[PDB]
């Protein structure tokens, strides 16, 4: 499906926790 959305899911969500 995506390539970056897991990385974005890794961290991004947790940058702005």
Swiss-Prot record:
Compartments (UniProt record): Secreted
Q: Which domain of life is it from?
A: Bacteria
Q: Report the coiled-coil segments.
A: none
Please describe what this protein does: Acts as a pheromone, induces cells to develop competence for genetic transformation.
Q: Please report which protein family the annotation says this sequence is part of.
A: Belongs to the ComC family.
UniProt name for this protein: Competence-stimulating peptide type 1
**What is the protein's species of origin?**
Streptococcus pneumoniae
Q: What gene is behind this protein? A: comC1
